[PDB]
Amino acid sequence: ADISRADALALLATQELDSIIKPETSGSAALAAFRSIRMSAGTVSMPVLAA
């Protein structure tokens, strides 16, 4: 009778997006706002005025 789309299926072209759909990334609020120091020891001790 006729060439259906199922009969032609193996001949059909294909297409792909060039890129992945994903949310925007961002960093920690912590490292953005607060000051930081290099530690050389794995614990740092800090004197504080108390009275």
| 48 in contact with other proteins (CB under 8 A) | yes
Torsion of CA 15, 20, 22, 24, to 10 degrees: -130
DSSP state of 25: P
Residue in the block written with tokens 């759909």: 21
| Per-residue binder mask for other proteins (CB under 8 A), 6-45, x = binder | x-------------xxxxxxxxxxxxxxxxxxxx--x-x-
Phi, psi of 23 (to 5 degrees): -60, 160
Nearer to other proteins, 11 or 33 (CB): 33
Instruction: Report the interface residues with other proteins, using CB under 8 A.
Output: 1-2, 4-6, 20-39, 42, 44, 46, 48-51
